[PDB]
Design a protein around this ligand. Structure first.
Ligand SMILES: Cn1cc(-c2cc(Oc3cc(F)c(NC(=O)C4(C(=O)Nc5ccc(F)cc5)CC4)cc3F)ccn2)cn1
Ligand SMILES: Cn1cc(-c2cc(Oc3cc(F)c(NC(=O)C4(C(=O)Nc5ccc(F)cc5)CC4)cc3F)ccn2)cn1
Lengths: 297, 297
């Protein structure tokens, strides 16, 4: 039971939400089929009805246990941010349900193969080295696009990239994760306080808490490493409190077994201690494209 | 076009600069908006970004026309000297940009009301006698602090005190000045040779070119006089070449119109021909505090 005063929301926000509102008899939420639980609420399988009558399989993200109007606001703006991107390697929005009674909803296209991290860890799938380089390239393209819209991601990692039925990677800001044998996704970050994924963070972000596109580039480097190790945890035998010093000493993730030398060289350029010396996403797309092009497998 | 060998700088200096480094990701230099031109280079309006997102209005001091590595060194040490002071009446440092390619930068907080001399001369502002005594007191407090760190200023005068949006005086070593109708600051001292502001200098400094805290006390006396006359030039009818003799004869700046007797008495004690007989800044803070406290206006 939720009653929301719509008049207490920013009116421009409400108007933006109206441009992507979902029809009254188009969405079915399968409460029986949970995808995950977060601090915000639940994510369900759902079935949206096309402007024609067609049945679209989607993921319904629902806001539950609401305590204040600011929480509704943030939920809705996150939704609106992703409405104004349009790129095959960035996860798109199907719609939003905002009513004065009941949980607000954000509806997303269903991603057949879930998150990229569980996919590359899954032993039934045998993604080849070339494939993994392919996935890293599609990610670079998504970040290249987002960096062109001056959007800073802050939480790039394999767990936040989804993978669709055509094996297209959609960069996303899911915030949830799951284990190999878990049926359901759960929250990665704490309910309150800053989102700090230490082992994906740039040296300067660890020190100053300031995130930039150039720090997304670092996280990408780490994301590449995940791909080439098929989802190994980074710096496993290092405590999250010692990471900073470890980096300051000049140590870096080591070359994974079947990772090509020039791709590992890309990862290092991503981890350059000076941000402005790291490559842009545009340069990464070109470098990794060249590598992919000349790779045999 | 300038390229600097960082390895040719003292390594401790470079390490100190690292503790206050700014990212080329955070500073915007408005080359279109010049504040002043000196022999070192230019000062621009600029916009620095807070460690997460806030836009800070600053002044960017840039080193241009560099001929040798010693010049870079001095520029940078001046910056570092002012990083290790911390006092509300001493101008602080926002940061330094030191890169191999391009002009080195020192970034400072923007002072809404510019230098103290132009402020008290400005007829749109009607600072009362009490206010002016207030400004002199804030200066004494700044010098008191600097004298406790064994720092000798050498060039204290109203033109080198800045004034912020709360009307706090920041003692500084700006080195620049401007006229009532000039839109832009210019150099006070010659390109080459010693910085010698004759009408603010202690008798012994005029003779021996040695500067001490006790000679800063003299300059302060003169600075007080500027304040009480709302920025009149000192010894106007005296040539800079005859000042020494004039002082040797025992003559001193006269009592300004609405200056209180006991504050003028403070100024004289500052101009005592024997340095060790002048008051310390700590004594000046007490004396002027008492005067300010019992002043009605
Ligand atoms: C088999 N399987 C299918 C699934 C499955 C699970 C799904 O759940 C979600 C996935 C998300 F990515 C978000 N994301 C979000 O809610 C937001 C988001 O994506 N932000 C954002 C996006 C792109 C940007 F560039 C920048 C920001 C608004 C935060 C939510 C979800 F519920 C969805 C589809 N499919 C899981 N397993
Ligand atoms: C409206 N308006 C605002 C403005 C305006 C102009 C500004 O220009 C500057 C002011 C300075 F004081 C320095 N100072 C310096 O560069 C140094 C300095 O201050 N050293 C120092 C400082 C304090 C000490 F106790 C001892 C030494 C290193 C020499 C530089 C500047 F570019 C800045 C802000 N605001 C001018 N008009």
């Amino acid at each position: 039971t939720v009653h929301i005063d719509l008049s207490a929301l920013n009116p421009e926000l409400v108007q933006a939400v109206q441009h992507v509102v979902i029809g009254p008899s188009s969405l079915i939420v399968h409460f029986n089929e949970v995808i995950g639980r977060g601090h915000f609420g639940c994510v369900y399988h759902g079935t949206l009805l096309d402007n024609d009558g067609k049945k679209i399989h989607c993921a319904v993200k629902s806001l539950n246990r609401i305590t204040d109007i600011g929480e509704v606001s943030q939920f809705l703006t996150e939704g609106i941010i992703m409405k104004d991107f349009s790129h095959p390697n960035v996860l798109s929005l199907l719609g939003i349900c905002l009513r004065s009674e009941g949980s607000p909803l954000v509806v997303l296209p269903y991603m057949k193969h879930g998150d990229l991290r569980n996919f590359i860890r899954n032993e039934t799938h045998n993604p080849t080295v070339k494939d993994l380089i392919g996935f890293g390239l599609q990610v670079a393209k998504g970040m290249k696009y987002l960096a062109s819209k001056k959007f800073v991601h802050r939480d790039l990692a394999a767990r936040n990239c989804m993978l669709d039925e055509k094996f297209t990677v959609k960069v996303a800001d899911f915030g949830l994760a799951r284990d190999m044998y878990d049926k359901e996704y759960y929250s990665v970050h704490n309910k309150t306080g800053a989102k700090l994924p230490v082992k994906w963070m740039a040296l300067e972000s660890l020190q100053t808490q300031k995130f930039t596109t150039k720090s997304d580039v670092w996280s990408f480097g780490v994301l590449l490493w995940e791909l080439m190790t098929r989802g190994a945890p980074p710096y496993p035998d290092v405590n999250t409190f010692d990471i900073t010093v470890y980096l300051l000493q000049g140590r870096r993730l080591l070359q994974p077994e079947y990772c090509p030398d020039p791709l590992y060289e890309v990862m290092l350029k991503c981890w350059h201690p000076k941000a402005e010396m790291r490559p842009s996403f545009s340069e990464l797309v070109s470098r990794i494209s060249a590598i992919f092009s000349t790779f045999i497998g």
